[PDB]
């Protein structure tokens, strides 16, 4: 069907996959760094959610190079995906307003 909704759906699936792989890779990256808290899977999934939404409480965060690269991918993907939803909503509203006008 319509491209904007296909892309939204696709954005959401991709984001879920990035969260899950980010959790797994953050733990991998961070274990072996003294002081690191981002080292068990359940809180890593939480950490990646709060990073993707860009909420970032500061209860958890990577301290290594690769953990931080992982973090950046997660941010970019959360911001991008949510941006894509906004874009798709604007396409929807614009098309319906063209109609309501008779255009």
């Amino acid at each position, epitope marked *: 069907s319509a491209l904007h909704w296909r892309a939204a759906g696709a954005a959401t699936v991709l984001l879920v996959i990035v969260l899950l792989a980010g959790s*797994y890779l953050a*733990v*991998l990256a*961070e*274990r*072996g*760094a*003294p*002081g*690191a*808290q981002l*080292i*068990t*899977y*359940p809180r890593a999934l939480w950490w990646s959610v709060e990073t993707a939404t860009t909420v970032g409480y500061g209860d958890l965060y990577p301290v290594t190079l690769w953990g931080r690269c992982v973090a950046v991918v997660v941010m970019v993907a959360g911001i991008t995906s949510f941006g894509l939803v906004t874009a798709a909503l604007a396409t929807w509203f614009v098309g319906r307003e063209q109609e309501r006008r008779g255009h």
Partner: antibody
Amino acid sequence: QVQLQQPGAELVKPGASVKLSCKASGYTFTSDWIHWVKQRPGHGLEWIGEIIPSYGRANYNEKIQKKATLTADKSSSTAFMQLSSLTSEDSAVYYCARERGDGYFAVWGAGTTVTVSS
Amino acid sequence: DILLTQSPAILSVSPGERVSFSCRASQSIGTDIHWYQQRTNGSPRLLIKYASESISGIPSRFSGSGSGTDFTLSINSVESEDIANYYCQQSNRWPFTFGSGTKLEIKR
């Protein structure tokens, strides 16, 4: 059934090496870590290192001199610890344990008694 | 690394009494503390996870409490099979560390 199988004993000569095994069974996930823990007679539990067999990345206790090298075999489901150049300081029970990536050792091997003697 | 202090090192108690083992962390670690029992010549056995969570197969006798830096393993009504060494373990920060151990002793 015994989730983690270790040999009961290894005898090793000063300066020689040994390779301990730990055969895992039961539910196995990519998230699983295998830890190794050293206990000297009468003393407590000391953490040596960990390996994630699904990836082969290993990390080590930095506070102590590095005698160990951890490896794992995905097909035979076996974690190995190579102890090199031992002294009587290295004579101990070495346990393996499995952690499901959530911080605690749900299950332990029975341990391998390592004696360093001529 | 996080230091885990367990004092007293030995604890004497009379049968059926309530006993409390102490574990203190050198910094704040929420509830990321787990407790192990090790009998003479046995391997460690998990009793309590995340400071207060039951494991199945462990007698209801055993409970845990605490958060931050101060943790307690408790046994309602001690009995003979509880004679063991008791260790705490932290998973808040890398590397995981163990406490030094409390031995439980019964006065019969």
